[PDB]
C-alpha cells in the first residue's frame, strides 16, 4: 500500500509533503534547503524555488505520485496531516476559502499537503492559512502549474 502524501518532520517543525509527477514536493518554509532522509543516506532537493515557497526531492519508497488537475474545478478539498478532508471554494490562482472555517489548530501542521479537485487530482499544495483571530477562513496554495513549470 503506497501513499501519495507523506508526513514529514524537521527537528523543530512538522508538516506534510505531496508526491506529484515523481517528485516529493513540500513547503520551503518548512524544509528549507534540507535533505530528505533515506535508508541509503541523505538525499538532496531536485528543486528549490524560495520564490514560490517550494522544494522538491525525488519521491521516496512507499510513495505513489498524484496526478495534476485538468478538471479546472473551483471545488477543492484540503487534506490535513490527520487525513481530514476540508472543502475549499477556490477564489484565485492560489487562494481558496474554507466552506466551514475551522480553528487554526485544525489546519496546523498540514502545509505541503494537497488541494484536490473532485476527481482526486492535485490542484496545489497547501501553503499557508489565512486567519482572522485564530480562525482559519481561507488558505494560500502553490498551484500545481507552478510545480509543472519548476520542473
Amino acid at each position: 500500500v503506497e501513499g501519495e502524501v507523506q508526513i514529514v518532520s524537521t527537528a523543530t517543525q512538522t508538516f506534510l509533503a505531496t508526491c506529484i509527477n515523481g517528485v516529493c514536493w513540500t513547503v520551503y518554509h518548512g524544509a528549507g534547503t534540507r535533505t530528505i532522509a533515506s535508508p541509503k543516506g541523505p538525499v538532496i532537493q531536485m528543486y528549490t524555488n524560495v520564490d514560490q515557497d517550494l522544494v522538491g526531492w525525488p519521491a521516496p519508497q512507499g510513495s505513489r505520485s498524484l496526478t495534476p488537475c485538468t478538471c479546472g474545478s473551483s471545488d477543492l478539498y484540503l487534506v490535513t496531516r490527520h487525513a481530514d478532508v476540508i472543502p475549499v471554494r477556490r477564489r484565485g490562482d492560489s487562494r481558496g476559502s474554507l466552506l466551514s472555517p475551522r480553528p487554526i489548530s485544525y489546519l496546523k501542521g498540514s502545509s505541503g499537503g494537497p488541494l484536490l479537485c473532485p476527481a482526486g487530482h492535485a490542484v496545489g499544495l497547501f501553503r499557508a492559512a489565512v486567519c482572522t483571530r485564530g480562525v482559519a477562513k481561507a488558505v494560500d496554495f502553490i498551484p500545481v502549474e507552478n510545480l509543472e513549470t519548476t520542473m
Binding site: V1, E2, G3, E4, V5, Q6, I7, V8, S9, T10, A11, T14, L16, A17, T26, A31, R34, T35, I36, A37, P42, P60, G62, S63, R64, L66, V79, R81, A83, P114, L116, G120
Partner: peptide, 16 residues
C-alpha cells in the same frame, strides 16, 4: 539537519 518521513497518507483509503 535533515527532513525525515514519520508516517504516510493514502488518499484512496486503501487497506494494507
Amino acid at each position: 539537519g535533515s527532513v525525515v518521513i514519520v508516517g504516510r497518507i493514502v488518499l484512496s483509503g486503501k487497506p494494507a
